[model samples]
Target: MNIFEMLRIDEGLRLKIYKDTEGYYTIGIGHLLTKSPSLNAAKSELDKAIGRNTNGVITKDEAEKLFNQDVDAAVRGILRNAKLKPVYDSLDAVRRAALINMVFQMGETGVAGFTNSLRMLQQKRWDEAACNLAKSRWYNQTPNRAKRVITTFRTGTWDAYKNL
Candidate 1:
């Protein structure tokens, strides 16, 4: 079976990827999420979840922590809301998850701020939307991220996560 087939993540769980209280973030089992002000606790929690793997003993936690319940709830609510159904319906599983991840990282307000980006996406102006994505302050912090998503937008495939 494939990775998604193995994981078998449901829409509701995917939608509630993070808790919503505040300052909540999640990292993969092996990836480090650390050294940032807004994401301070998340980093530590991630480190804890992964633990030490130097001696070839690597154990990882799946459910990291509940940092912000309300914020998480809000995120799920946003996904389940009637208004977002059209966009949600139009997207495939990967694209939907990717977009949801973007919104999760950026928040409803930040996603709202990407009105032009969304418009460009809807128009299928991949390069222009990528340029617009690069214009964001987040782009300056993570150029690789911008490049990856833009590539996904253009190619309609996010094969980057396959190795992970």
Candidate 2:
């Protein structure tokens, strides 16, 4: 058998979700819900599960195995939400991907909190959306990432962030 097969066998397939030995919510061999902040909020929730102040670890292979599945689910989730769906579909692929990435980082509710940006997105007002993004709490939290997203929102293409 190949390494992929070997990894699966070693990890063991699990159809049901359960807490791992370290108390993380895990399913499908070793998918951790806590790793994706958008999926599960709060470090305390993870701590509560394990009865400790620690989070668990997964192997590189385990992380790789879960990455695409989780991302695809997040993408579908963006489309499924009524508030986000319209704005998502309105965007070009680059802008849509940027928004999806943002939603992945912040959760849909957190993105929704950017009311002005979403409104600009809905109206296809790219420049206004970019400005709104820069003015956001999300931007304040992470200027570098916010710059890239703002650039994408403004230009409708991924571009290197230049000092403004």
Candidate 3:
């Protein structure tokens, strides 16, 4: 099911929320919601936001283009922000995954733009990273999800992201 349909959101509004690692959509904290982008606009916006060509959100022919543009931009951003090569940077993989997940849920600049998030990662302070992540505007948006993921990152168990 699509996010709008699942959430029963009939109004045309763009909102930033947390998406689970598994790609399940959730509400974000402190993130802003704007008017839903038009199909064409969504395509371009998603592409730029994700750093790649995107077909945008839609079903059947109406959504046909190729890939998710916003997702692409997010991956690109992940590589750039972490200062790592695109293919795969072990140093950045964890943060990138969490970041992209957040972006996908929060939209473009969403959760990734947090100053504390960057600092936490740079310092390698896992506990603080978890706390920082939970303190974001998206913290309460996803129920207990943020707490669980942050706990995993802080605990070094790697179980938090296992399913995702």
Candidate 4:
């Protein structure tokens, strides 16, 4: 159940305006309310949740719904283009889960910046691929979660992760 486990552990469940480590206004399973895709959708959902009032709160159910939508979009966004489909398919289930986790944290565009790392992954260079991913500002911003994923990249297994 790493698919569900990843977000609950890495993102956590929050029904309030929980600003992320990157300072983005986020809510419900780390959905970035200020990001491109969610900028309006999350706000609109919050509006619906409170009948058009801005109370900076959403129900647990609403949050859970957003998590599902966000996860689907993240997965689709990655496999859509930029040579990721084959690389994604080349991976085992655990490694594929790692890819989805990375996409969830960093938008597909952001993950696209890791061309070398993804290509390294395509080449099946486990340790090297993880090394490239580790050498980044993302690693500094959220080292704990980043380390867990990097370990996933290194071992191609969920053993190094917690709640995954």
Candidate 5:
């Protein structure tokens, strides 16, 4: 079977929270869980999967592979389901990549929550879209990344936040 099909079976895409074999809160394709809502939670989850001391969870290479694969899958879904195909098709590669990155970060549902911003994007209103992005809690939670993404969304340039 193709990798995508394989992943669907192996990981089991879950949109809701559930418990794992060990009774730890887990969800979404073998993703581990923790009480804290931070990146640090992932580290411990990795340890739990692999072994606290062993390098069994996943290697850096594996993580990178998953990242690329997930991004591609996410983009495909966005293209298929979102009604912004025309705008998406009209964007340059860099801007498209920025949009894909946003999809990757937020998941399709989360990204779709940005209705006003997405409408602005569909209208090709770069400044408005960027401003709408700034109005999000994501911007307040992760200013640096939000800045980088917003700049890319506005300028369609990879180096938009090079100095920042």
Candidate 6:
């Protein structure tokens, strides 16, 4: 729970709709808010989920609730797959958190596409895993956070966790 919350903190908390670093419509700690690939649809989805609408605003408790719900989805995406489940199980808790963080940001399909990295991680070749991550487009897209993610894989440590 705490480690996923670490992923939550790294994603940042928001009480209102905001454009994430990649310009995706996201809310409440990395909940990407696209249902039908349109902003209008996303707003409709958010409104549909809420009883009391405050335009695009949600309370912090609502934000917390969304992540609580969403994190399970992320976890399921990792463990439900026949390919990734063994890899997920082989990892320690902190490394599992790193995987969760990746899936949360990139979705199961996206993370699954990291063929070399995933293979390396499943083999327990930590350096190779990090190296593969550094060579990806995701590394280029958000280099700062990606570096930290890479570091986590490299060392099997919670390098991404920031306590304050």
TM-score leader: 6
Worst 10 residues of 2 by lDDT: 1-10
Q: For every model in order, what is the number of clashing pairs?
A: 6, 0, 12, 0, 1, 0
lDDT of 5 by residue, 34-53 (tens): 54554356455655544454
Ranking by TM-score: 6, 4, 5, 2, 1, 3
Query: Cα deviation of 135 in candidate 6 (Å)?
Result: 1.0
Clashes of 3: 12
Please provide, for model 3 over 43-141, each residue's C-alpha lDDT reduced to its tens digit, 9 standing for 90 to 100: 454455445554433333222122243346556766565432322254344444555555545554554467666566666787777777777656775
Off by over 4 Å in 5: 1-56, 84-86, 161-164
Give the winner by TM-score: 4 or 6: 6
lDDT of 6 by residue, 23-69 (tens): 77788888888735577777877887666555888988888788887
On TM-score, the stronger of 1 and 3 is 1
Q: Write model 1 residue lDDT over 1-164, tens digit each, in one string.
A: 22232122211222112332233343332122333445546545544644532222222323322223323543574476554444545655555554555554455556656767777766667678768877887667556655555555556665644443
lDDT of 4 by residue, 1-164 (tens): 57768667889888887668877778878877764345456566567644657677878887888788888998898789566677788898888888889889987888877889989998999989988888999998899989988888789777665544
User: Clashes in candidate 1: how many?
Assistant: 6
Compared with the true structure, the alpha-carbon lDDT of candidate 3 equals 0.45
Count of backbone collisions within predicted model 2: 0
Give the runs in model 1 whose Cα sits over 4 Å from its true position: 1-59, 62-86
lDDT of 2 by residue, 1-164 (tens): 22233224333455444554446556554445564433245344434543555444434554555645545665788887888888888878767767866775567777867777888988988887888788867789667667766776788754433232
The pairs that clash in candidate 2 are none
For candidate 5, the TM-score is: 0.63
Question: How close is every model to the real structure, measured as TM-score?
Answer: 0.52, 0.62, 0.49, 0.86, 0.63, 0.90
Candidates' C-alpha lDDT? 0.47, 0.62, 0.45, 0.80, 0.62, 0.80
